[PDB]
């Protein structure tokens, strides 16, 4: 199933969607996302659109 | 200024927006987001909408 994850922060806000057999799997899959995005992830920047693309 | 951050993963995909004086500040602010969301963040779930809300 598909789940809609909301990344609501103070200086950062957004919406994302992970696909997992269940909410837990999704929750876990998401954890891996941030777990890997966190502070050692590969962040690419696109000045052309002032947008950054965090690729797992 | 406002920046549009794209969280593009394999099993997870989405879009977010951080506000920072510059791209770097934004990038840094975002890092704090994931840095704090990562594996020890406070994740709240809303079954009513199958949506999770990660609050910094």
UniProtKB/Swiss-Prot annotation, chains A, B:
Gene this protein is translated from: spg
Name of protein: Immunoglobulin G-binding protein G
Function recorded in the entry: Binds to the constant Fc region of IgG with high affinity.
Upper lineage: Bacteria, Bacillati, Bacillota, Bacilli, Lactobacillales
Provenance organism: Streptococcus sp. group G
Subcellular location: Secreted, Cell wall
Sequence repeats: 2-56
């Amino acid at each position: 199933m598909q789940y809609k994850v909301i990344l609501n922060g103070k200086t950062l806000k957004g919406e994302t969607t992970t696909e997992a057999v269940d909410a837990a799997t999704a929750e876990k899959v998401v954890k891996q996302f941030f777990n890997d995005n966190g502070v050692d992830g590969e962040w690419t920047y696109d000045d052309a659109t002032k947008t950054f693309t965090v690729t797992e």
